[PDB]
Amino acid sequence: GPSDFEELDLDGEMKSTYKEEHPFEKRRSEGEKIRKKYPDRVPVIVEKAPKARIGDLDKKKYLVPSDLTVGQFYFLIRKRIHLRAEDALFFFVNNVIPPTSATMGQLYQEHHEEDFFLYIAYSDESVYG
C-alpha cells in the first residue's frame, strides 16, 4: 500500500542518456566483461541531472578503484567539471545522496543495476530533478 504514502520521487528511475542510447544487452555484456577482467575496479556512469545548471562532463564512463571513497570521487569530478570551490555539487544514486565515507566498491556492490554498471547523477541542486 505505498499509494497512500508520498515517496518524493525517490522510487523513480533517474534519467540516463547512456541507457537510452545503448541497449541493455550490450551494456550488460560490457559490464560483465569489465567486472571479470578488472575485479578490483568498478564501472560507473556519471551523468548530469536534467534540471542541473552545472559544467558538463566530457567523459561519462569511469573504471574506478574499488577502494576510492565517494568523497575522493566527488573532488575528482568537481575538478574535472572545473567547478568553482564555492559552488555546490551533489551526487545521487537511485535518487539519494551517498555518504562520502563509503567506497565506490561498496556503492557499486549495493546499488549497481542489472547491466553491472553503477549510475551516478550529479547536480548543483540538493534534490534530483
Swiss-Prot record:
One of its GO terms (molecular function) is microtubule binding. It comes from the Eukaryota. Belongs to the ATG8 family. This is Gamma-aminobutyric acid receptor-associated protein. Residues 61-63 are annotated as: Interaction with LIR (LC3 nteracting Region) motif of ATG3. Keywords: Apoptosis, Autophagy, Cytoplasm, Cytoplasmic vesicle, Cytoskeleton, Golgi apparatus, Lipoprotein, Membrane, Microtubule, Protein transport, Transport. GO terms for biological process: autophagosome assembly; autophagosome maturation; cellular response to nitrogen starvation; chemical synaptic transmission; extrinsic apoptotic signaling pathway via death domain receptors; microtubule cytoskeleton organization; mitophagy; positive regulation of proteasomal ubiquitin-dependent protein catabolic process. The keyword Transport applies. A lipid is attached at residue 129 (Phosphatidylserine amidated glycine). Ubiquitin-like modifier that plays a role in intracellular transport of GABA(A) receptors and its interaction with the cytoskeleton. Involved in autophagy: while LC3s are involved in elongation of the phagophore membrane, the GABARAP/GATE-16 subfamily is essential for a later stage in autophagosome maturation. Through its interaction with the reticulophagy receptor TEX264, participates in the remodeling of subdomains of the endoplasmic reticulum into autophagosomes upon nutrient stress, which then fuse with lysosomes for endoplasmic reticulum turnover. InterPro entries: Atg8-like, Ubiquitin-like_domsf. Its main location: membrane. A lipid is attached at residue 129 (Phosphatidylethanolamine amidated glycine). One of its GO terms (cellular component) is autophagosome. Residues 14-35 are annotated as: Interaction with beta-tubulin. Interacts with GPHN and NSF. Interacts with ATG7, ATG13. Interacts with ATG3. Interacts with alpha- and beta-tubulin. Interacts with GABRG2. Interacts with RB1CC1. Interacts with ULK1. Interacts with CALR. Interacts with DDX47. Interacts with TP53INP1 and TP53INP2. Interacts with TBC1D5 and TBC1D25. Directly interacts with SQSTM1. Interacts with MAPK15. Interacts with TECPR2. Interacts with PCM1. Interacts with TRIM5 and TRIM21. Interacts with MEFV. Interacts with KIF21B. Interacts with WDFY3; this interaction is required for WDFY3 recruitment to MAP1LC3B-positive p62/SQSTM1 bodies. Changing residue 129 to A: Impairs localization at the autophagosomal membrane. CDD domains: Ubl_ATG8_GABARAP. Heart, brain, placenta, liver, skeletal muscle, kidney and pancreas. Residues 49-129 are annotated as: Interaction with GPHN. The gene is GABARAP. Residues 49-81 are annotated as: Interaction with GABRG2. It is found in: Cytoplasmic vesicle, Autophagosome membrane; Endomembrane system; Cytoplasm, Cytoskeleton; Golgi apparatus membrane. The record marks 30, 41 as: Interaction with LIR (LC3 nteracting Region) motif of ATG3. The precursor molecule is cleaved by ATG4 (ATG4A, ATG4B, ATG4C or ATG4D) to expose the glycine at the C-terminus and form the cytosolic form, GABARAP-I. The processed form is then activated by APG7L/ATG7, transferred to ATG3 and conjugated to phosphatidylethanolamine (PE) phospholipid to form the membrane-bound form, GABARAP-II. During non-canonical autophagy, the processed form is conjugated to phosphatidylserine (PS) phospholipid. ATG4 proteins also mediate the delipidation of PE-conjugated forms.
